[PDB]
Paper text:
The ATP-binding cassette (ABC) transporter, MsbA, plays a pivotal role in lipopolysaccharide (LPS) biogenesis by facilitating the transport of the LPS precursor lipooligosaccharide (LOS) from the cytoplasmic to the periplasmic leaflet of the inner membrane. MsbA forms a homodimer and exhibits a topology similar to other ABC transporters, comprising two NBDs and two transmembrane domains (TMDs) containing 12 transmembrane helices. Upon binding ATP, MsbA undergoes dimerization of the NBDs, inducing rearrangement in the TMDs.
MsbA (78 µM) solubilized in C10E5 was prepared in the presence of 2.5-fold molar excess of KDL (194 µM) and incubated in the presence of 1 mM ATP and Mg2+.
Numbering used by the authors:
A (entry chain A), B (entry chain B): 7 to 579
Write the structure that this text describes.
């Protein structure tokens, strides 16, 4: 199939490191030739060694054995290390490409499955692919070289008994196969019948409810007696089938061996045959069995690994973010407006946003009121263009976002929330993340102090250079709120979205973040996903979206006079 | 431990068939002696055979091989068949005892575990126990006899190189173990560190939502670059560790072999050493490895099987139905009375029935109305005594049922419902089930005809002798209603419990079952779990039980005048 073409597809990666593969191949060939020579070592030990007197063969053969193990160990280590080096480099390159492509695919991808299996894809799948390919190569080369060496050793050493074996070993195998298959079929038949009787016993048990109420407990025992007798008979037949199977293979193999001996008995091949020369020949037919099985399984292993590589490449090539816009926006000082916006969340046939009309005035803040799942976060998601709207237009400065570059637009929006991501880095490199080459330490410290986020930083191990993260020094919810506020204030994002916390923190923590938000952070065009009524009451406009449709719009007092859904919810609050 | 005492507890079962075990043991010993002799066959083949000329050794040795393998096949078949016979008989006896005890446990037990796992207990567990014990015996005897034979062969054949081996081999095994363990420890350490770096990558993936909105996608790539480099280095170290463990083991074994050869080199043991006598000695140390591993695994396999036997015996001995009553009731012609009856269904903390009071007049029927889960079937269950009441008294003829024998009491109750159990037997042996020695065929046919259940019986293959069941000729719901009605009418049970169907069948089937029920069946003290308002309207008393309490008592018209819950349900119906 095309599984062997997967090697050609991977070749542009493995080929640059060909030396690390040539060394491994040479080492494996040397290993095979160090094992074949060991097998050939037997004949001098018997014919010219142990026989007659110890004519220095017995004092020199162990030295050869020791040297040959030294060679085998060295070559095995060299081959394994080189194979590991090339596999590690291939895995590293493939992981790099996969990740670089992976952090450019639309958020939707990461919603289809959780991040847990993505780490599996980028960690275990590449290791599996490289391990399977390396195993295929290290098996084919080594076992093929060993088989060739063993066959050469056979033919050189009294080929008369070798040419027989190669014409006799297969046919016996075929015969063996036949017998096994036949008897296997018999077993299958019995299994089917067994199932029936088993079901009968099961029915018996379900009769309990109806055997106690009548005068049972005796006829039931007799019927189970019959069923158990039948079960025992069937088990006996199965065991008899297996135990008449096995000795047939044994006898066929031993008959083959007897025929080999009888053929060697004739006075035509004995002349080139001695006591020691056989011990290398028959031992070859003993050591040859395993390489053949490895060669048979090498194709299955290769196919499995390289078919995993199929999905690993399928993830590698796909569609990415449609950054088909071309205009570049700096310092958005216009109006964010929703006009007949209809959107269906991926995975949800029922639309989540329907003809949503919403204007966010410049310099003013709006509070978006609604229940959980009402669609009051999908609006922000569309603002950041994590999902493209199905119908309508959303515009800032007067132009729809699908005609804007994704880098420029997203640089205009900064979100602060209770669930913010902290990269494993210094606190300063997290305040000015991705823009550390544009802002100085003084600006970072100014932002941190102005966002009321210095007291918890000046008390750290290294202050603003502490390595922070979730796999390191872990910060509290208020602390990460403050750090995100410092980041957003430093970046000076014209577009602001806010997800207010659903729970109140400590008095010191709440006092600070509240001061930051109100006095310092919120001075721009803000869209607040409000949860506290105090925040709602201090907003220039209130919008109450309801499961896809906004019901009422206005100020807090105006909506209270309206006596709508907002008034009822505020009464609840 | 006591796992070896499990054999003593099972001995009263296996011991009666000792001959089937003695034959198996003798056959296994003969198999071991046919393998040891086959190994000892090598020396004449090399020394006195293949060497010099073929002095009739080469034409007689294959005959010995053929005869020995014929003996091996015969003895293997005999041993396996005898072991299978004794195992099958033990399994049959244990299954019989288990089932006979199992049909005596109160319904409760059968509610704790579904009927699926009970069939597993009575089918697969006993086979597992017998298979494990038989494997333990067939391994210990055979492999121990083989080991003894091989050691005798070693000591007889040039003991000088045998006494060495049984000294060097063990110490080499210890040394090998040491090395492996040490390097294994190293691997473990790396794994821990590996985990950390893996989590880092996973963290980075979860940063997707926070990297697109800022000017990332570059520093992220650099961080993954560093992480991937560290991952590759750690994988390299792991492979290096494993690839430095294999060669050392190999080298240690080869050094042991070289020391053996050097020791044999000295002119003190060579005199008894010949070319052919050595192949038999070293081949023994090759064939001896597998029996040792089998002996090591014997105890583990035995413990596993005989610990499964522990739970199989735990089920065998337990509590049964409390048939502590001694008085016998015939033809119950009194009243069924519930007085302050409070009962908690097993597995439910909240009580199922609470101070339930109820009178079932002699010769009259009562319709007990309620919703699903209201406890409208637990009352019938208590009447049948599938469960014992926690407090209160339920009595027929004037005496509580815990003062009555369970056989006599349950002969006074016959339940007809839509879900009735049909045993795999003749239709007549189901009409007069468990009482086929008391009623003739004429009575069975009379009951079947009188219950309007003959038209569907006269049209079967053999009429009233058809083998019916759910694993055979399957009957319809109305047909099984009719067959249960015929059974109850034949038994002439004074007390009736009727569970009316929740759905209407065909017009012919409904007409027959309804006629049977009303005209013929219901002429006794009846407790009806009514579902249709028509059946309720022709009842002498209506009871509405819900949530362990009775809403109202009275007749249909009286309850309608009461304007209670029954009136509302009748309006609903």
């Amino acid at each position: 199939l095309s599984t062997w073409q997967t090697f050609r597809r991977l070749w542009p990666t493995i080929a640059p490191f060909k030396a690390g593969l040539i060394v491994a191949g040479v080492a494996l060939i040397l290993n095979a030739a160090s094992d074949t020579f060991m097998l050939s070592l037997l004949k001098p030990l018997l014919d010219d060694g142990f026989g007659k007197t110890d004519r220095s063969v017995l004092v020199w053969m162990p030295l050869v054995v020791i040297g040959l193990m030294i060679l085998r160990g060295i070559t095995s280590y060299v081959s394994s290390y080189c194979i590991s080096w090339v596999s590690g480099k291939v895995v590293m390159t493939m992981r790099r490409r996969l990740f670089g492509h992976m952090m450019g695919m639309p958020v939707s991808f990461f919603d289809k499955q959780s991040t847990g299996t993505l780490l599996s894809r980028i960690t275990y799948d590449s290791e599996q692919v490289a391990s399977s390919s390396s195993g295929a190569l290290i098996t084919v080369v080594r076992e093929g070289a060993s088989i060739i060496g063993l066959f050469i050793m056979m033919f050189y050493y009294s080929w008369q008994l070798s040419i027989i074996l190669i014409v006799l070993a297969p046919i016996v195998s075929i015969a063996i196969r036949v017998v096994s298959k036949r008897f296997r079929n018999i077993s299958k038949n019995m299994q089917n019948t067994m199932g029936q009787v088993t079901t009968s016993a099961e029915q018996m048990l379900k009769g309990h409810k109806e055997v106690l109420i009548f005068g049972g407990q005796e006829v039931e025992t007799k019927r189970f007696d019959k069923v158990s007798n039948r079960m025992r008979l069937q088990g006996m037949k199965m065991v008899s089938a297996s135990s008449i199977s096995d000795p047939i293979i044994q006898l066929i193999a031993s008959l083959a061996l007897a025929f080999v001996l009888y053929a060697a008995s004739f006075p035509s091949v004995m002349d080139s045959l001695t006591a020691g020369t056989i011990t290398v020949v028959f031992s070859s037919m003993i050591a040859l069995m395993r390489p053949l099985k490895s060669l048979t399984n090498v194709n299955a292993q290769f196919q499995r690994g390289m078919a995993a590589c199929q999905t690993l490449f399928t993830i590698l090539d796909s569609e990415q973010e449609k950054d088909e816009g071309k205009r570049v926006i700096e310092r958005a000082t216009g109006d964010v407006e929703f006009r007949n916006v209809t959107f269906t969340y991926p995975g949800r046939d029922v639309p989540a946003l329907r003809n949503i009309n919403l204007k966010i005035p410049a310099g003013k803040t709006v509070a978006l009121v609604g229940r959980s799942g009402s669609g009051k976060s999908t609006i922000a998601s569309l603002i950041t263009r994590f999902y493209d709207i199905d119908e309508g237009e959303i515009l800032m400065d007067g132009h729809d976002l699908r005609e804007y570059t994704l880098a420029s637009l997203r640089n205009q929006v900064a979100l602060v929330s209770q669930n913010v991501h902290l990269f494993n880095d210094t606190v300063a490199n997290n305040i000015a993340y991705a823009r550390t080459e544009q802002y100085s330490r003084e600006q970072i410290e100014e932002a941190a102090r102005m966002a009321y986020a210095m007291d918890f930083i000046n008390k750290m191990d290294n202050g603003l250079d502490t390595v922070i993260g979730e796999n390191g020094v872990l910060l509290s919810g208020g602390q990460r709120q403050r750090i995100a506020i410092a980041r957003a204030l430093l970046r000076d994002s014209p577009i602001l979205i806010l997800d207010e916390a659903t729970s109140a923190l400590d008095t010191e923590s709440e006092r600070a973040i509240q001061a930051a938000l109100d006095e310092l952070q919120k001075n721009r065009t803000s869209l607040v996903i409000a949860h506290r009524l105090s925040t709602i009451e201090k907003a220039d406009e209130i919008v109450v979206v309801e499961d896809g449709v906004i019901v009422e719009r206005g100020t807090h007092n105006d909506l209270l006079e309206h006596r709508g859904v907002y008034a009822q919810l505020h009464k609840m609050q």
